Structure 1
Amino acid sequence: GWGITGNKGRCYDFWMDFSECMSHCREPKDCTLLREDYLECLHHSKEFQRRNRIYKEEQRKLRAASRK
């Protein structure tokens, strides 16, 4: 849970939230929201897929307006 320039890493906070959950929650689910939070920090998969959908719909509209 370190960082490339010290400073608590990027989401050692999200991992602490996902570990405190997995500490005192008896199931792997009901602690999965925090797991998806932490993996979102790691790979930015949700953020990148949303940005790409934004840009994709924009590009489709622009191409439909350009070529028609």
Structure 2
Amino acid sequence: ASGWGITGNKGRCYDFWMDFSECMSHCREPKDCTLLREDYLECLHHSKEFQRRNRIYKEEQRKLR
């Protein structure tokens, strides 16, 4: 969110945060910037990508047996 990176460059998730915050700067209803909020929160934790990979692994294991 701050944009100060660990290695002296721009933060990894700073661009997503600036897209989300720019969306919220001209949208009084927060239900239309949800798609950018989800992107920012997914850049922080990679929950969706990890879930997809876990689903692929589980499907592979089920086919194994």
Q: Normalization by structure 1: what TM-score?
A: 0.86
| Identity rate, percent | 98
How far residue 18 of structure 1 moved from its aligned partner, in angstroms, is 0.4
Q: Which runs of 5+ in 2 are unaligned?
A: none
Moved over 4 A (4+): none
Structure index of larger Rg: 1
CA distance in 2, matches of 1:34, 1:16: 10
Alignment correspondent of 1:65: none
Count of residues in Structure 1 that have an aligned counterpart in Structure 2: 63
Q: Deviations over 1:12-40 (max 9, x none)?
A: 00000000001111111100100000000
CA distance in 1, matches of 2:20, 2:58: 33
How far residue 11 of structure 1 moved from its aligned partner, in angstroms, is 1.2
CA distance in 2, matches of 1:6, 1:36: 26
